[PDB]
Amino acid sequence: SNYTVKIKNSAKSDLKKIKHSYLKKSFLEIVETLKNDPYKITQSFEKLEPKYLERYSRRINHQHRVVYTVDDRNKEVLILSAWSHYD
Amino acid sequence: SNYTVKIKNSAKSDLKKIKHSYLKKSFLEIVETLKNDPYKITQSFEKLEPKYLERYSRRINHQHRVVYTVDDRNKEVLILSAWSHYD
Amino acid sequence: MIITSPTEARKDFYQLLKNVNNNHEPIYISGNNAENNAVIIGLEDWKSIQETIYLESTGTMDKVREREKDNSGTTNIDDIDWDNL
Amino acid sequence: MIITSPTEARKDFYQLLKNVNNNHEPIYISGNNAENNAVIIGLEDWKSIQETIYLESTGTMDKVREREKDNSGTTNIDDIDWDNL
């Protein structure tokens, strides 16, 4: 690891849907990349607009993303969504 | 009028800021066009993406927009925002 | 998806500009190095995208989506009592 | 704002494709017939825009912005109990 990867507790309901969808293995692959280098140009890494806010996404599959931010100073990644839906 | 123009009640708080900005005259000129032709190519009229959702905006000024949808069959315009700050 | 090479795009450039504006569809320029891959889009479609990004970046579309699905009701814009805020 | 004519863009097309990606700024193609005006954008920036519009329209970014605001706390991803989710 180089970064601590956290998830917002309110995003845990997302992980329940990931688990039921059998997306756990894809999701944890993204987690492993976030631990090593959250800016690696893999997994369809995207810098979301507006770019000055520095929110990012990676593809779990063609429907769902992990959306996250990064605290560079403290080397922490914050996962905010793992399910691409309004709830 | 060709169209009835309504505003969502949860959007009335936008009009308080419009009033206090002295943008009421500008806003009311948009209303007058919405009553006549909400598709007129004036007032920086823009079809927002994704276009299949059919939302539109006009400029109150360089910063603030009226965002609205149009019920073509019932000839009603629904204003959803008239202030482009997030509170 | 309309895809063409840099070389073919340059030879067909004038027709491409017509096409992107009459079909409202972007054309992907994809060449040897993904460095210099690009997209050409009609100006009108770009202005829609620019305006959408602006209203999303300010949180305006966030509030629009919330208000759209709420049960607050509507008021005819002429019935607004401006002097009462 | 970087603005060029259709003919200048055609002449310097290969350099224009390098510039939109090196500079991350679109290039505006503006000519006599305004109906054929266009924009060139690097593919990476186009992909960012498209990914933003998609996640915004699904309501995902609304959910994200609200979660950034709440005080639900965080859990280190390795401390999630998957078996009991």
Side-chain angles (χ1 to χ4, degrees):
Chain A
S1 306
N2 303 311
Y3 293 73
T4 302
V5 180
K6 301 185 196 284
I7 184 165
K8 206 80 198 256
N9 281 330
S10 51
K12 291 200 270 185
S13 52
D14 286 3
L15 298 185
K16 195 202 303 221
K17 304 181 194 173
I18 289 292
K19 177 186 181 166
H20 294 358
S21 289
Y22 202 54
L23 293 173
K24 176 180 182 181
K25 179 168 154 146
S26 312
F27 170 75
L28 290 182
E29 284 194 9
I30 291 182
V31 169
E32 285 310 303
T33 304
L34 295 175
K35 283 179 181 170
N36 163 51
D37 177 6
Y39 310 111
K40 213 202 290 181
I41 309 188
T42 53
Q43 305 168 324
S44 308
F45 170 65
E46 289 291 347
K47 305 196 184 177
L48 306 181
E49 295 284 6
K51 279 175 185 185
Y52 80 94
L53 290 186
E54 305 181 0
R55 309 209 183 82
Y56 308 104
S57 80
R58 291 171 179 270
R59 276 191 194 220
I60 299 159
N61 62 15
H62 291 347
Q63 288 65 244
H64 300 288
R65 318 288 201 257
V66 177
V67 180
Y68 61 98
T69 54
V70 182
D71 181 339
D72 298 288
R73 194 173 290 120
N74 293 306
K75 312 280 264 210
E76 290 182 3
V77 175
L78 181 59
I79 295 177
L80 293 152
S81 179
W83 188 257
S84 302
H85 189 229
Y86 54 76
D87 60 30
Chain B
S1 308
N2 295 324
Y3 292 79
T4 301
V5 175
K6 301 187 171 184
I7 184 167
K8 264 276 186 141
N9 286 331
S10 57
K12 291 179 168 186
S13 51
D14 291 359
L15 305 187
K16 187 190 180 18
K17 301 172 184 165
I18 285 305
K19 178 186 163 61
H20 289 346
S21 306
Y22 204 54
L23 292 167
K24 168 171 167 177
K25 180 173 195 185
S26 197
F27 172 77
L28 284 185
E29 291 188 7
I30 295 170
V31 164
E32 287 308 296
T33 305
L34 294 177
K35 284 171 171 183
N36 297 331
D37 181 12
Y39 302 117
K40 203 177 197 223
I41 293 98
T42 56
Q43 301 164 331
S44 309
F45 166 68
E46 293 289 0
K47 305 179 166 174
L48 304 184
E49 293 290 345
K51 292 194 173 171
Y52 61 85
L53 294 185
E54 311 198 337
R55 307 203 190 90
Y56 312 100
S57 76
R58 289 165 186 270
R59 284 195 187 188
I60 306 168
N61 69 350
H62 67 282
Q63 185 176 185
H64 297 292
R65 320 289 204 252
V66 175
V67 178
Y68 59 96
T69 50
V70 182
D71 185 336
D72 292 303
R73 195 164 320 246
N74 294 296
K75 297 302 188 279
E76 291 194 32
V77 171
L78 181 64
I79 291 170
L80 298 164
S81 162
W83 190 254
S84 311
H85 284 163
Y86 203 82
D87 304 356
Chain C
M1 259 205 171
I2 318 193
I3 301 97
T4 183
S5 78
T7 299
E8 309 163 305
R10 185 170 133 103
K11 300 194 310 223
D12 271 87
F13 193 67
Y14 292 119
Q15 187 60 39
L16 286 206
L17 296 176
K18 290 172 69 191
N19 284 351
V20 307
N21 278 295
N22 293 309
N23 315 331
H24 276 50
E25 279 317 291
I27 178 141
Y28 291 85
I29 315 302
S30 151
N32 62 317
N33 203 299
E35 233 70 68
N36 309 336
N37 290 356
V39 180
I40 294 175
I41 183 75
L43 174 62
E44 205 156 83
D45 295 346
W46 175 248
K47 284 171 74 193
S48 294
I49 286 146
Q50 267 184 332
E51 175 73 356
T52 299
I53 290 298
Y54 171 74
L55 298 172
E56 299 285 1
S57 291
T58 60
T60 299
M61 294 321 288
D62 187 333
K63 189 178 308 111
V64 166
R65 281 183 291 265
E66 171 175 41
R67 294 167 165 175
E68 230 173 21
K69 60 175 89 174
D70 72 32
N71 272 79
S72 65
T74 65
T75 295
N76 294 10
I77 192 64
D78 295 314
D79 295 338
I80 291 289
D81 176 14
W82 283 91
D83 285 339
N84 275 306
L85 174 147
Chain D
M1 232 196 317
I2 316 170
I3 304 180
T4 190
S5 83
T7 291
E8 301 176 298
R10 192 192 181 241
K11 190 203 95 199
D12 214 15
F13 191 59
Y14 299 138
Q15 184 62 46
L16 255 53
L17 298 171
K18 300 179 201 96
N19 293 349
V20 295
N21 287 289
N22 287 336
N23 302 334
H24 290 267
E25 220 54 61
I27 290 171
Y28 292 84
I29 304 166
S30 197
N32 301 90
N33 181 0
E35 299 238 307
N36 301 335
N37 283 358
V39 180
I40 312 162
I41 180 141
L43 173 67
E44 282 176 30
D45 290 338
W46 174 259
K47 286 185 170 175
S48 281
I49 288 170
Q50 291 302 319
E51 169 82 356
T52 299
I53 288 163
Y54 166 66
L55 289 178
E56 287 291 1
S57 72
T58 67
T60 303
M61 299 309 298
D62 294 349
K63 188 175 63 164
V64 163
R65 281 178 293 265
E66 180 69 13
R67 286 171 176 178
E68 290 173 337
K69 292 171 185 173
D70 72 45
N71 209 299
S72 64
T74 56
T75 298
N76 290 6
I77 194 66
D78 295 335
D79 297 335
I80 295 294
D81 181 8
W82 282 90
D83 299 336
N84 289 316
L85 224 36

